[PDB]
Amino acid sequence: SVVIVGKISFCPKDVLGHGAEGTIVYRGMFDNRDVAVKRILPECFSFADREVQLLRESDEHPNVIRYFCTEKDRQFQYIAIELCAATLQEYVEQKDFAHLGLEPITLLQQTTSGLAHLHSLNIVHRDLKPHNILISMPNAHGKIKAMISDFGLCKKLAVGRHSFSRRSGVPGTEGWIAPEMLSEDCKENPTYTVDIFSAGCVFYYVISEGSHPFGKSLQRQANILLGACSLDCLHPEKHEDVIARELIEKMIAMDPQKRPSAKHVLKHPFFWSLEKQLQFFQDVSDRIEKESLDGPIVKQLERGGRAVVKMDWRENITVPLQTDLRKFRTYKGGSVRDLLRAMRNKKHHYRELPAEVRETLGSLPDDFVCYFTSRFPHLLAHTYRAMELCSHERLFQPYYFHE
Amino acid sequence: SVVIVGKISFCPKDVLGHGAEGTIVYRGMFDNRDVAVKRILPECFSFADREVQLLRESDEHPNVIRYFCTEKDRQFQYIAIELCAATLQEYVEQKDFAHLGLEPITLLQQTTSGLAHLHSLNIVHRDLKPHNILISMPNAHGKIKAMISDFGLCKKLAVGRHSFSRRSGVPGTEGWIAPEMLSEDCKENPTYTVDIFSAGCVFYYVISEGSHPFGKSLQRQANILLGACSLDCLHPEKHEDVIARELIEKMIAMDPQKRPSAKHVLKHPFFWSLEKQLQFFQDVSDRIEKESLDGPIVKQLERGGRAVVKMDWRENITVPLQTDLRKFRTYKGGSVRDLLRAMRNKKHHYRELPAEVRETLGSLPDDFVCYFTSRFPHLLAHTYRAMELCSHERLFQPYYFHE
Ligand SMILES: Cc1c(CCC(=O)O)c2cc(Br)ccc2n1C(=O)c1ccccc1
Ligand SMILES: Cc1c(CCC(=O)O)c2cc(Br)ccc2n1C(=O)c1ccccc1
């Protein structure tokens, strides 16, 4: 028995899953393309028409599911969309991340792009969770991508409006709904920020390989409203983790105003290569070199540096570098600027530096930059936030978001 | 009136254009989606079957036209694809260009990208012309993109093969058909290069604002076969023109094996920012600083450097720079490396230079590099080709294509 509703065809025996509101998703064909078919019931025909329009308006982007067509029966309405190979959930739940390279982060970056695309179209998803974040089929050359799905609970903000009342009840799924949506009072109407919070938890769900910032399933929602976030899978003294901690912590704040935008999250160091990181260090040092001590830039860079530098950075580096630096007298052990200024000098002159000092630093640029991030795991986080005072400047545009 | 073929609807009174073999294109809609439908007559039903299938294997790429569906009638066959705003022909022939800034080169880079994608899928267009390059309908934010269409005459190379016999006549338009396609004296059958020759003409067509590298319309195909190419639109002593010459002259090469691949074209200086050119001069200089004069790299950089440096480059730079460099007699005016190094030095210590030598150089980075490209209009093209000996080096990966 093969169901043929117009250009869509599927066999009822091939069920890919069950959805809510009696929606059943089969595997089928459309225009000889492999698609997933969704049967919707008359009780939901209206909810399905809005999802298709919001899909038609965004599937162009590579990180949004591709909507194809819709055919109607005397009994059902069928939605044909691009056939994937797995959800992010089964991915986090069943891949050997050790063999998986930097894929997990690029999946997080792609999902973030999709969100910024949707937010550029005044579309809020409201139901972002690892289940409806899909993994594309492997392409002709063997690559996969992440795409956003389940547009049933999406909302297009009204022209000229930048929030949305809580009239659609409490859209979303327990454990991933931001507090404003579930809180009994209405200090302010929700907005795009409810998506970041969901996204923040998802970032952690991937980098923890299964954990949630707000506890286990049954107590999540109650912790979310109570503010009981715990990012335990992230060391406090690891460079990578300290950077992730900064981002995810900002993404799951209780005040949705203090939550970053998706365009900001795309620029975050959490996504930077080592080559880029070292580059950010070089440019900060050059911008501050002739900045006075009374200047705001330098005063923000040095507020709280003693902990960043670990009291005295000269007492925390390798002996071959300590001796090399002792040759002159131009770097203070308490200055985070001078630590960055030292990194600039020892990079420029790297080739004309004694082999013993070259061997402690490592090859450029990856081993060089790691030398200083492992020793001072708060250096990038501290200086990134400090240098925000120069996000308008052309030189720094590659690191912040500032239209 | 309006003809409704299944989910495709159009009005015969809305004709967008006419093709070959009686194929008419109307403006229409598919699934509430503004599309352009194609009416295909019976003698041509098989050409569409191929095009549709090929389109379904590559339409995903942002710069390859998006194909939606295809229905059939009692006597006709219809094909609905993305509706565009113009073709590159109309864009070139009817756009100020003075207020278009750099949009035209972004277009050339986009059609290249889509063509590299098609080649990665073992597909040769074989009929690339400013007519098949359509411009996107403006976005939800006012941006456009170029795309490739007219896949009817495309060729999916046999499995493992990297060439194709001329068994299907000579597909393509008089004026854009590569010479290997028409001649019988050729021993080598055509490959993907045949698409690069055509693109190399379009490249020139766009920068010349309509002109062709092989003359006027009727004598064009005649001139192509004879190798008589003329790019008089490009000055022989202007930095920008020298670069575009180097690339175009290699894409329209008479010998197919001398033509850059699509991925090669994508890295050519023709597409670099001003800052990227500085970064190239800096990396080239830094890389050759500790290289033996007897070394192959140095011997290739100076092979012909006399015309490049215009004899003593110290005598072709502004006087203020001439005085500030007179103290260093290390710089040999007949060395291109010495010129590149003098640039590297002027860039690093730019802030500590006397104001006279700073305002004669210009604001970093754009005006600084222009100081040398305008004065030495062969410096880049000379260095880029000679330094190919280092294309394999990670340092230079941003600048060349290896694998
Ligand atoms: C696109 C798609 C949907 C629709 C998503 C939406 O629009 O909400 C889907 C639903 C279920 Br249940 C089950 C599978 C579904 N699937 C897939 O292709 C797919 C997902 C995981 C593994 C293999 C294939
Ligand atoms: C999508 C599209 C097609 C189909 C391309 C194909 O056959 O692959 C088309 C054909 C002609 Br003729 C003419 C126009 C065509 N057009 C356009 O949107 C368009 C292009 C330029 C100016 C105005 C509209």
Residue numbers in the entry:
A (entry chain B), B (entry chain A): 562 to 964
Paper text:
IRE1α, the most evolutionarily conserved UPR sensor that is ubiquitously expressed, consists of the N-terminal ER luminal domain that senses unfolded proteins and the C-terminal cytoplasmic region that includes the serine/threonine kinase domain and the endoribonuclease (RNase) domain, exhibiting dual kinase and endoribonuclease functions. IRE1α oligomerization and autophosphorylation under ER stress activate its endoribonuclease activity via binding and cleaving RNA substrates, triggering downstream UPR pathways. For example, IRE1α induces splicing of the X-box-binding protein 1 (XBP1) mRNA that encodes the transcription factor XBP1 spliced isoform protein (XBP1), which upregulates genes involved in the ER protein folding and secretion, promotes degradation of misfolded proteins, and further relieves ER stress.
